Amino acid sequence: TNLVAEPFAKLEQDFGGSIGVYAMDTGSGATVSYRAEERFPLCSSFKGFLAAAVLARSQQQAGLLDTPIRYGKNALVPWSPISEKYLTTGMTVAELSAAAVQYSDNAAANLLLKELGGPAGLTAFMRSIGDTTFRLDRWELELNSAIPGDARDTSSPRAVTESLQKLTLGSALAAPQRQQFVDWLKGNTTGNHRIRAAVPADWAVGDKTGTCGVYGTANDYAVVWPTGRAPIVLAVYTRAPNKDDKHSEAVIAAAARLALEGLG
């Protein structure tokens, strides 16, 4: 029997679906795992790793991040509020990356995906950092279908957390790029009701959300700096068996609380 897991099982039963959690305390090595190796749809959470992949490329391309991109209306996608706002001015690669991370801007994400060689190019970047689980197969908005049993556009909570650690705290990015990735995550605007709702107000948090909508499917991953302590990295993913089942931000926050409470 796994007593640590019982509150998570109760939570997912109340929710009406499945919850996957992995959390790592980088100071002690302590972890919390629940369905941590199961696949869940990435939804928009892929956009954080997209931004990291762009940052990695910028390490060999002088001024890539500062390069202006003058996209047209044909690049726009529903829920592209930053891209629409800057349509008449253009945006730099860095601004597109920040929009994808901090507003889940769909047009910005697809524009950057194209620069990287599409979903397979982002998947290849994740392979290059040692992530063998992540797979992106489609673009926005098709990647949100979240069909039960479909492995397209999925990863696992553990693989997400391990890759997030490598990119934000480890050596997968050069230091200036690691810091930029962290800065973008800390400026996210979409996650106030998810992992951020689980952490004490004085702790610093960088996160990236995902919401497929269908099949009760939504998620969040975060790096969390408790004041004066080594950071925690964690991922919380959800799904549900019926297409019209609704996702729950409260369930994501509640799972994150249990993860923080369960850490040594």
Ligand SMILES: O=C(O)/C=C/c1ccccc1B(O)O
């Ligand atoms: O970050 C979120 O919670 C939502 C992102 C989003 C919004 C509209 C359409 C697609 C997505 B995404 O999850 O792919």
